[PDB]
């Protein structure tokens, strides 16, 4: 009968006569509540046995006491918020100091020296991002600092930004206040250049999504037509590398539309045309890509990028006779060829045995078992077993439902 200890936590078997017990469905163990008992705690509000006494005093202290604030304090805190301009100036100062004191990488021979970790740059980066409403990529900053030329092209831009802000210029804040028209200022241009450098570092690292986000923020900041064209071209290239063909095409079209507002010396228009053509090629519309390349050549004859893309399209056209036509409209996008696409598939791909349409199905905001999926009444669906609720037969078949 009795083999182990008398306590419920004992392992081996017991008997009703010797050690009578209550029906405890599931209770914690000697080492504290487990994930299952904690799931019961969060869902039912108490452990499944019910003999336990709920005690969430610590949770109450963490949430409700912390978020409680009287009306007067809540009203005066907004008025006593810090000074945005001074806070931004201090953030820029400390960020520049940290970047300057960041050590330079030793160029070892025979192997690649590990780039020193950026511990002290995060907090200055966090405050700078908060102040400017922008989001800087830590990977991009790491790559920029590791590269020597990019490091200088970032430090000079940051110093110019600091100088122009200290001189009393806050272009975003002034524009927002006025809106509550003019062209880009020196401070805004320096900020855009800094963000473009960060995006270039992101591209060198391989973080095309971060590069695209940084360039999008730079575009948001910019207002000059030339800056808009250049930023649109950069965003188109970043989206092409990130496997965002719709975004790349949209940015390229916007750059090509802004073409007239830009002076002849700039190449942003040609870059936008190249990006649009590349997006079309990746979407597998070779006729559209060729037409766009022809238009770009007619606009800027002799552009190196346009010539290279035209040569590549000519090679693809020479290969096409093997197929006797273009890719059929049926698929028109099926093939995937980018490392960004491969990484996305590896991350968000439906794994075998989990994260698939048979493991869990995500409803509006909730997880459901495959049987309860409202997107299909398959043979494993509960919806199949319902039928003829009482209104009408609703189906000709007479065996189930």
């Amino acid at each position: 009968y009795q083999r182990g200890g008398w306590s419920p936590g004992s392992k081996h078997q017991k008997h009703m006569t010797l050690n009578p017990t209550l029906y405890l469905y599931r209770f914690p163990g000697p080492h504290g509540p487990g994930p299952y008992t904690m799931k019961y705690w969060w869902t039912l509000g108490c452990f499944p046995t019910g003999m336990e006494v709920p005690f969430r005093l610590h949770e109450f202290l963490s949430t409700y006491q912390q978020e409680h604030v009287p009306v007067e304090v809540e009203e005066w805190l907004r008025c006593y918020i810090k000074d945005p301009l001074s806070e931004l100036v201090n953030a820029s100062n400390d960020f520049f100091k940290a970047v300057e004191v960041y050590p330079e990488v030793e160029s070892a021979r025979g192997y690649k020296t590990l780039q020193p970790s950026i511990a002290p740059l995060l907090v200055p980066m966090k405050k700078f991002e908060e102040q400017l409403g922008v989001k800087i990529s830590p990977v991009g900053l790491r790559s920029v600092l590791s590269n020597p030329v990019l490091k200088d092209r970032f430090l000079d831009d940051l110093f110019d930004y600091k100088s122009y802000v200290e001189k009393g210029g806050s272009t975003p804040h002034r524009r927002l206040a006025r809106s509550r028209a003019e062209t880009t200022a020196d401070d805004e241009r320096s900020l855009i250049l800094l963000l473009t450098t960060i995006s270039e570092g992101c591209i060198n690292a391989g973080n095309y999504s971060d590069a695209a986000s940084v360039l999008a923020d730079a575009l948001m900041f910019c207002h000059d037509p030339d800056s808009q064209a250049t930023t649109h071209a950069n965003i188109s290239f970043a989206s092409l590398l990130n496997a965002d063909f719709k975004g790349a095409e949209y940015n390229g079209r916007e750059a090509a539309l802004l073409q007239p507002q830009v002076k002849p010396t700039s190449t942003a228009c040609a870059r936008g045309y190249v990006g649009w053509a590349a997006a079309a090629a990746y979407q597998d519309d070779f006729e559209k890509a060729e037409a766009i390349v022809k238009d770009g050549l007619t606009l800027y004859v002799g552009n190196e990028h346009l010539e290279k893309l035209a040569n590549k399209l000519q090679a693809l056209r020479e290969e096409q006779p093997s197929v006797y036509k273009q890719v059929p409209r049926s698929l028109r996008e099926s093939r995937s060829h980018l490392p960004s696409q491969q990484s996305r598939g590896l991350l968000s791909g439906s794994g075998k045995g989990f994260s698939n349409e048979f493991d869990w199905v995500e409803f509006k905001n909730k997880l459901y078992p495959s049987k309860m999926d409202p997107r299909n009444n398959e043979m494993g669906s509960v919806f199949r077993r319902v039928g003829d609720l009482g209104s009408f037969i609703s189906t000709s078949r007479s065996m189930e439902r």
Binding site: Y64, E67, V71
Partner: peptide, 9 residues
Amino acid sequence: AAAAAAAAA
């Protein structure tokens, strides 16, 4: 002029 406060007084 009123707000939803967790506790009062």
